Amino acid sequence: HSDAICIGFGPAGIALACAFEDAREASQPLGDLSIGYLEAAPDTQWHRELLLAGTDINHHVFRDLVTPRNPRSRFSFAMYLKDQGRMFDFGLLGRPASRHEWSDYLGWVSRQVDGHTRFDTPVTEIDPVIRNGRLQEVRVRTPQGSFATRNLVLSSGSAPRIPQAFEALLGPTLFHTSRFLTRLQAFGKQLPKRWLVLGSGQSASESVLELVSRDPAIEVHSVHRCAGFKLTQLGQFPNRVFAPDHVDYFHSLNPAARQRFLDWSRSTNYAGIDPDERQKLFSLIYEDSIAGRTRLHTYAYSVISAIEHTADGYRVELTDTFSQRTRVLEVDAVVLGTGYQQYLIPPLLSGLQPWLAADVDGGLLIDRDYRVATQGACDVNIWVNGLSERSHGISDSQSFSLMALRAGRIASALERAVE
Amino acid sequence: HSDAICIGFGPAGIALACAFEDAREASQPLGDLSIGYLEAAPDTQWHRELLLAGTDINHHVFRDLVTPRNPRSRFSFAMYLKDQGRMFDFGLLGRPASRHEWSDYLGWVSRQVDGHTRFDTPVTEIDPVIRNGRLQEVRVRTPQGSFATRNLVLSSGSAPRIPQAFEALLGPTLFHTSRFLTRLQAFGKQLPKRWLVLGSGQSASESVLELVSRDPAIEVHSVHRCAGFKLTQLGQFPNRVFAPDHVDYFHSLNPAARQRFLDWSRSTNYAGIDPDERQKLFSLIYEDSIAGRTRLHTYAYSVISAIEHTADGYRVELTDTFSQRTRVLEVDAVVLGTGYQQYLIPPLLSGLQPWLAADVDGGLLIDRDYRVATQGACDVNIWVNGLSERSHGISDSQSFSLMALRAGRIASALERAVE
Amino acid sequence: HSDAICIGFGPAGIALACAFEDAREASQPLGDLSIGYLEAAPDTQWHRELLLAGTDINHHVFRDLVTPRNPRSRFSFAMYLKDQGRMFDFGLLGRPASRHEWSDYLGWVSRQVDGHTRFDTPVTEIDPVIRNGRLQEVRVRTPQGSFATRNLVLSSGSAPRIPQAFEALLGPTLFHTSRFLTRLQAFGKQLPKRWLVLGSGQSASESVLELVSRDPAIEVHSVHRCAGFKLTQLGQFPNRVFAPDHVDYFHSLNPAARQRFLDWSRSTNYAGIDPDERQKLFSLIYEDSIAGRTRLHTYAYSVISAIEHTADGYRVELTDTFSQRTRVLEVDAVVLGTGYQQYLIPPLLSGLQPWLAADVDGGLLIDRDYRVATQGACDVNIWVNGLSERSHGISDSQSFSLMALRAGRIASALERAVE
Amino acid sequence: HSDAICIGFGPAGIALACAFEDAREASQPLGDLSIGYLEAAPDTQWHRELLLAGTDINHHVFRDLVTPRNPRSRFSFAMYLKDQGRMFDFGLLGRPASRHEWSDYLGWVSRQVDGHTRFDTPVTEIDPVIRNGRLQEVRVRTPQGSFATRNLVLSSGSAPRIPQAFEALLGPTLFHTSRFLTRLQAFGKQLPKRWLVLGSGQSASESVLELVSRDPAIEVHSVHRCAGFKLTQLGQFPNRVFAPDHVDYFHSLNPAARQRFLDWSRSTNYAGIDPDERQKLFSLIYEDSIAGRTRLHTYAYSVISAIEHTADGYRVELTDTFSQRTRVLEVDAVVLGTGYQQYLIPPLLSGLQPWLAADVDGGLLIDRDYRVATQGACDVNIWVNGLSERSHGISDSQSFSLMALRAGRIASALERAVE
């Protein structure tokens, strides 16, 4: 039993722990609240680096896990650089920090605030506890025991979107971007030559780049539902505008207007790629072409209309959505840069449905402070620590600065809920 | 009587003359064809600078009026720099050439190929000439006489889009971006304080910048149909992709698919601004805010739902398209960055309608080589030297490189048509 | 009587006060030490902006007045941005902060740590206090009274270098860069046309830029002892390398080797200009030249060998140092970007000479911690809070980060000296 | 027998051939002059890429082998891009062309103008031909025969500077940068771990980068006579200023003043590195350090005062020039980035000394048009197609634009000399 349980100790949960630790170290009341963290994965560099993949880190160095909420925090990137002796040299770089550096930073913060974190500890189920015909507690169930609380934070996220056509095919030679590194490693010393990469966002771009980087004979077929990479937005949304203002506006709309907004928003099609990532991919392809190798093939306005696994790889049928013209590609492997599914009700909350209010789609009803609206519940609070189009008008991001700000809103709400 | 008449001696017509002059100077057959040019405006720096406004010139220096068609042309920008003694210093700049420099270049080319151009010579009408019950010639009519030809090129463009709500109001204090400079000059030494600028493209951006640049007390209200300037595309379309490939794809679609493409294309909403222009505007506003002046006000997802001219300026009602919430602004002047109208049939071709084929909207039917399809016509050819969404899938651009390429296609087609 | 007196409340003294305030607010012992600050100039934005002139601020935002010493300080630039509500927009700029912004920051810090500062309070003299035939105290004398201390910090700097040839001429039409703004303002609404600007550093560059910016008919003659602006180093020294490592190396040399080092160092001639300043000046001159105005004239390898004030401005004789060829220029005004004199013994320490050790040139003998070495003194300490070639191997800089680091070394040394 | 012989068919000789071919194709008189080219090396991509090494190609694309002399040449980079179909994509890169691209360009030009070039044809000696007691011809001697001419162009350059201390040591594990690639290849699949790289210019930088790039365990000791790479000039000289103006000024000095100029010039120490090369090296080292590897060690103000080859690599003694402090390094291999020797009289002109005038150092006396001054010679002309400090005030560069301009001056001088 603790005052709260947070599920997930990725950046979002770390950011939240940093708010509590800032408070503890400053002797403020919030620091007394006891919170435990349950993370399914192990405490490893590999896993933290897995978490940053697909994320646009072409942003200012102040937009770290704590500074936008509290620049005096001992977990700021400036404190990280100073501890590592690199403040001056970092400034001379003239570029934003690398993914690898942000990972290291993230391990450096984690290591300092993880005293209440249980790793290798997946949540398998969350069971209700009813007492007077009304929900009073929940029991978070894990392989290493169970935990009880009135206050729950979900900081674990959502799952890969795998269209039905591909589910039977998931394997070593056809996989989602979320397992890109692991899957590539399984090939050992020899990658297959012919690749198809589906999708138009940063995860797709980085996969393409990594494939044409690893082996000079690899050929990549890059399929886009709309225009290709050359017409994507430069920078992911949270790096172009101050997202909380857009989250505010979205909450100020009534549900009918929200749906009109999302229909416009979805057809506007904002999907953005770090401009340095675009540049790396375009420059490398260009250099390749000087020697005659043209190794990236682009198919715009296309969907995969059929696919089968044969003895000689995959036979993939593309259909151009406008012309209806079709063509067939034979490849050795396929990468799905299809992104992640927005849950209506996260699977872990399955058993609590009777005490959860319904939004217009039956899913979770989430307020501006990330709190889940309940019904027939006595003192039980739940927060979902992330963005979504359906609740907030914006796709979920691994933006460190957004996590910092959310952590502030949640940690304060958690304090009020214990008095 | 000449073998051809080109209407317009802006960049597009100059580019075309450069193809003929290249050919003449090289002794090639195309140089013998006699062509005259009729330009409504005078031969002045002011007018040439008026023509470049709103245009993204953040492109490579090779994408000039001739080089993409013929790098050996004596009208290349490299030859311009060498003639002016600035080749070395230009390279040291590390930035793209300025609008002012491209204007000067353009006057420098014009001055060398304008021996067949009649300026201050507007076309008021174009009359048919029928002989055997079929159209054999046209008579281009001007205030300074008339001209006869079987071969006509329209390089004059299209007109400002002025919504009905504003037509009665056009004047010194409410105007289109195409007269921005002229109108601003009329105020002399004192601009009005409160401005409304409607629109989201580069012409809107540059107007805003110029207004907040000219006077530190000016306040600008910037109204956008969708998201504001911070979410526009960086770079206009022809600077992001090789437009002719997209023009090819659009022509390869049948008319039903073209309409499906434009419906998608129009909701995707690509409207782009030179990234240095965005940067100039954002930096200046930011610097202003350090001293407390917040002088640019943004209204997204908004339309003007009512406007009236009172004794104290304009009273403007905005409606947020999603929320339906309204608000009122009082301003002293209004700038319409509404862009330009695509004609279905340009006004100058009014009298030739009976010999012009019809596209799906009754307008001109234009092929991939910019030729207008005719009916019941003997040897008479017409070209429209520009882009449009309806014929080519792309908005009309003042892209110098595109003009160069078009000039090649048209000048060759003109040669074949005289034998 | 206070434990210490610091003379100067420019950035250097502010940085020092920030160390004490950080300590006070954290309850650390250093915060108990009482220190007063005497600043000759008034507490005004004009004066703070006067202090930043000539300074390369093209450096990373962490290199502020406190962060390199203590990122958790409440006076960090991140805390400044957050207080002003500009953290997100600052990141979107993609450029370093402007001089104007750093000034504002500096006023924002000053306002929070100036409770022990007396402004408009010049030090006219510092008198010794001898007791047992040995120096025990000093009496800092001002127009508003006198102050006694064993611990003295000089944070006031040094004076403009005015060669003998110019001293009689100093006036409204011939002046040093340190009074550039004040002097320009005296002209009111009309500047003179013909200017000569002597010097090759950033103060010279910025003067040139400001002159050709203010008036399109102004002509500037820019005279350089060596090569001109196009061959200056990009960035001032402290922005190219971590200066303290170079200060360390210089202290590790014995005096004979130091002189050999400075002779090499002085002939290497490192004088650097913010690359954006060079760019602004070169771009503007280039744009000017498109229209025919060539308004900046450069004379390399030149000295002024004679000058006289006539009724028609100045008659200036230049001599090329290599060729010995001479020429005469007639100008209306002259700007001396000659920099600042390194004192051997600052004038304010005149009366303490008998208790001050001598370096190889008779001047102050300063250790690595900025302490002045004394003789026959009981408990009396003096620090000079700045760099110099003669003591530290580097020219004095207004580098904010260096001030932060020095402040740490001095404030700790001050603490030890009071127990 | 031909009207002229040019020794060397690297960029300089290719540039010269382009002037003749431009003239031939335009029917101008210069095209009739017969000239043959003798190149020692073979016609291979490997060799052309060997020629560009150490060269700052961070310059504008107009500064190619022909354009600064004649933008209409069919050998312009714009014509190259157009022939390869890459003009548009090149512009989208937003960076300067790569070394690899400039090599390809250079092969593309060579292939079009090499019809008078004999490859694998070294000049071993050049013998005089005296007739009336005065020199009338020269006989260029090669392994494949001999050639006679009154007009000689030397476009072969100069030799690696190898200090005496190293001559006996030249081998697979200690080599000059000019054989860096060849030597590295000899190691096959395993490079040695510990490297010393001597020197401060671009060849040194690129060697360092390539070594730390090839193998993550390699350690590099980088020794500099003065300050290290962080204080080098950004950009080589010809990319910072218009070199011909500086060559003009140097020729306008009398010999006594030239020596004073070079003494200043040599102590100013301008040696420049492509800013993107510095950036690549600094970024990679920085990224390495995040994981704990610090693999580049810098020694400023140092010379190698002793070195010996032992059974366990090299034992190298460094002496700091100022402190006189020494230290010893043990490394497995050494790279000499010592640059190239300026000949006083090139070895190939050994036998013509009696007909060659003497400059102040006994060496060649070369005018502003690159002509060698002779004595007692009837109609015999020689040109050295390169820069040098001793004749022109500037170090020899592989600047393509400079070659273009020189080619113009030489080809015209060659024409006058045949009538």
UniProtKB/TrEMBL annotation, chains A, B, C, D:
A family per Pfam: Lys_Orn_oxgnase
Pathway where this protein functions: Siderophore biosynthesis
InterPro entries for this protein: FAD/NAD-bd_sf, Lys/Orn_oxygenase
Single GO biological process annotation from the record: intracellular iron ion homeostasis
Entry keyword set: FAD, Flavoprotein, NADP, Oxidoreductase
Any one GO molecular-function label of the UniProt entry: oxidoreductase activity
Domain of life: Bacteria
Coiled-coil blocks: none
Cofactor(s), names only, from the UniProt record: FAD
Family: Belongs to the lysine N(6)-hydroxylase/L-ornithine N(5)-oxygenase family.
Protein name: L-lysine 6-monooxygenase, putative
